[PDB]
Design an enzyme around this catalytic site. Sequence first.
Site, PDB file in Angstrom:
ATOM      1  N   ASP E 142       0.824  -1.218   0.034  1.00 42.76           N
ATOM      2  CA  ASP E 142       0.110   0.036  -0.030  1.00 42.76           C
ATOM      3  C   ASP E 142       0.838   1.289   0.039  1.00 42.76           C
ATOM      4  O   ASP E 142       1.474   1.702   1.130  1.00 42.76           O
ATOM      5  CB  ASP E 142      -0.922   0.279   1.221  1.00 42.76           C
ATOM      6  CG  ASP E 142      -1.559   1.369   1.577  1.00 42.76           C
ATOM      7  OD1 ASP E 142      -2.552   1.662   0.725  1.00 42.76           O
ATOM      8  OD2 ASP E 142      -1.062   2.051   2.129  1.00 42.76           O
ATOM      9  N   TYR E 143       0.938   2.035  -1.011  1.00 43.73           N
ATOM     10  CA  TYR E 143       1.865   3.043  -1.080  1.00 43.73           C
ATOM     11  C   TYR E 143       1.069   4.407  -0.420  1.00 43.73           C
ATOM     12  O   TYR E 143      -0.016   4.411  -0.378  1.00 43.73           O
ATOM     13  CB  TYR E 143       1.864   3.573  -2.684  1.00 43.73           C
ATOM     14  CG  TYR E 143       2.159   2.345  -3.678  1.00 43.73           C
ATOM     15  CD1 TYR E 143       2.963   1.512  -3.513  1.00 43.73           C
ATOM     16  CD2 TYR E 143       1.362   2.145  -4.721  1.00 43.73           C
ATOM     17  CE1 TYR E 143       3.216   0.332  -4.535  1.00 43.73           C
ATOM     18  CE2 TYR E 143       1.191   1.314  -5.634  1.00 43.73           C
ATOM     19  CZ  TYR E 143       2.360   0.457  -5.465  1.00 43.73           C
ATOM     20  OH  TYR E 143       2.358  -0.752  -6.248  1.00 43.73           O
TER      21      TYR E 143
END
Lengths: 49, 125, 62, 144, 236, 147, 62, 63
Positions: E142-143
């Site tokens: 998850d950026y």
Amino acid sequence: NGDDARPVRASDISVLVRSRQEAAQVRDALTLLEIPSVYLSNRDSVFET
Amino acid sequence: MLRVYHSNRLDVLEALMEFIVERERLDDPFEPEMILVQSTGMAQWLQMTLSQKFGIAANIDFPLPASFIWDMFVRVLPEIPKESAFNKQSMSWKLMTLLPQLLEREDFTLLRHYLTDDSDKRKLF
Amino acid sequence: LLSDLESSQELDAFVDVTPDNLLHNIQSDILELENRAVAGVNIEEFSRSDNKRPLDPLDSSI
Amino acid sequence: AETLDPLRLPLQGERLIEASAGTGKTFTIAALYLRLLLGLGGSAAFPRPLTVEELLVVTFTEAATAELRGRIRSNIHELRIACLRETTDNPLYERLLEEIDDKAQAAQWLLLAERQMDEAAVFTIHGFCQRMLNLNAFESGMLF
Amino acid sequence: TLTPHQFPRGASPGTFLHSLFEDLDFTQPVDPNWVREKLELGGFESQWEPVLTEWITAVLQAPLNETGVSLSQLSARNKQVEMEFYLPISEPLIASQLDTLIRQFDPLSAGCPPLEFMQVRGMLKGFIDLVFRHEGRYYLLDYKSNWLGEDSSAYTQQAMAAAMQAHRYDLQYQLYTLALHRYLRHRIADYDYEHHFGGVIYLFLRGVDKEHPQQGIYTTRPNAGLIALMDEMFAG
Amino acid sequence: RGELGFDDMLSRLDSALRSESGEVLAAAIRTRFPVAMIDEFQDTDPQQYRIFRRIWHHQPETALLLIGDPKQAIYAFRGADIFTYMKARSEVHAHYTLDTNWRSAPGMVNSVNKLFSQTDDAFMFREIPFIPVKSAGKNQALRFVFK
Amino acid sequence: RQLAPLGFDLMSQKPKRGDRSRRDDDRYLFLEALISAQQKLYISYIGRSIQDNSERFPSVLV
Amino acid sequence: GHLASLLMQLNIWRRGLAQERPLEEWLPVCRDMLNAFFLPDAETEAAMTLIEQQWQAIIAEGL
């Protein structure tokens, strides 16, 4: 009507006039003797009250 | 083969769909389960009911039938572009470019009366 | 269109509806493909009116 | 000025019906609408039955159009039940019923018209004109 | 000299970064014309283009978790871009009951002014950015675009953990991991959790550089007893 | 601006019909709607009459039933015309009239008939003959009593 | 809901089996609304206009 | 003075937006309008990005 009958109420009378001035002219006297009347062809907008 | 299911209520059909997808399991764990729908509300209802039965409903794709058939065209036949050159919009701009050239062709007299009387390109558009 | 296909293998799951309510009466008439509307071609049918289904006056389905 | 009976009116050319005060314009329109629907009269008949979407009726006020549409559909329904039963109470429907030759065909035609009532051709003048211009926009030279 | 530590704040720039990492070709090298055209679409100045290409190529080859390193080596066969999941929560979620086991099992449960919510039933909308595997051990990704860390001092190991306690990213941990756990249970035929999980990476997208170990990459392994009890609490 | 008004629609159809493609347009409307029943013809306009004339005045296998009441054209200010009705009455060869009267009292119909038959040529125009109407049979016993 | 076709459309002249039009669409949506209602139904329409106390009829479907 | 600055900008742009140019020259007009008449807030960025996206998509299909 024939043998049947019904009593006259307030809704069974219509009054015909040609302009709103004469409509008010009959409405003021009609209310002065306390007869509640409504003007069915009122072109008056809501915002003029 | 192709299997056609008739039913009276959508609950029985959706329970049959859940029964199939729990009976036979997909090989690749990352392969999406493609379900054809038409609206957004039906996709939402299918997702919520599938989640309520299984525990989670993810990797489900909900394409329009036109896009699904186009993806089948792309996957089966080769040298086919991702998106066609024939959409609703690009064909409208192409018809803008093409119509004044194609006018005066002995068969476009009613279109000539329509367009050539006066235009700020609104009639043409 | 569906019955016109060749290779299709068609199956059904038609759950029935018990006719008790007005709405279930209408849905069951739709499902079993019948017609319970009384027209009254003959006078001995047109006079009597006990062959339609009764309706509960406290029933508010439709 | 000839007196009018709606079962004897020739439906050709132009007819100028003059219906006086308190007379039943709506009744005359309903009777002629049913006759145009079912093809009756013989010498005073249109040479074919007509689909309900090909019966143009042009009326003054939108409320009047709604009232006329409701009246026509109700008369169609009553005449269809009368044709199914082969018996009726209304004298106009009785005259129509003895006028019709094939009552089963009449019942089928009226059923189709009643089910097609929701796209009937009853307009005010400004609705009729807008619809026909929007149809023949190429001839009229006006936008979509 | 421009740098990702000098890139401005806002939510639309975060959407720009997310859109850059939407449509890539990880194995293939970056097309300079394509990325400057994408910068044309986002309404930025062309002065940041070469440092953008260098930043993208740096984060593409980053050794995130000592195996599956250089995510330019991520095959399209074993990726899954931007899943969406619905997770039912029946038997109303009591906030204090969840916080009890969060305090019990999670080691990052020190910074807890918790429970800004009330018991809600139903489903749970959520969007996982990327789920992928490296010969088993399905990595969860998850950026996140984050603060103006002027130098690398704001991107240490412990300031990151303090900030993620400040923003309550641990609830994101357990919810995303329970989602992936139940999804693999539904999909993979009879897997063992400790054999196949290999989970969380929260890639802090800003604050990563060219040659710097453990700068902007964080890893959590869930306790594997937290998840089972929590799943039983949801589906009791 | 691209907008449009009601008079604009009538004038647009009228000029399109009066132009060179008007024959084609009239053929299309004749084929699509091959009978028309104009309710309330006594309140019409020259534009509407010219439209109906050019569409349905000839080329048979088409009918047209102008229904009206010239005694009630009370809309001169709105734009309606009684002279257009008189012109249409002059042009159309057939004439028809309904006979009975349903609503009014049997003495009331007779009173209105006597009042308007007071003199010959009541409506001060030759083209509006006030033909008396008879009361309906079912209402021959209406009465009103006041004390 | 009325949507008249374009007039120079070539599907309006000679139709076929699987063709789709908005009138048949809305009628079929009424039928599926009747079928999909499991327990109770509620059909409501404007009866009389509040200004002039006229009459305004329900739809042909109702 | 601020109102007269508004009127100067409106007059200059109603002069500038008059002629007919191809779509390549119609491309930057929307960006010029937005950054010349509006001050982007936290609320307004969604609408401004949507307007730029729709304008860009129209001219993109046209090009």
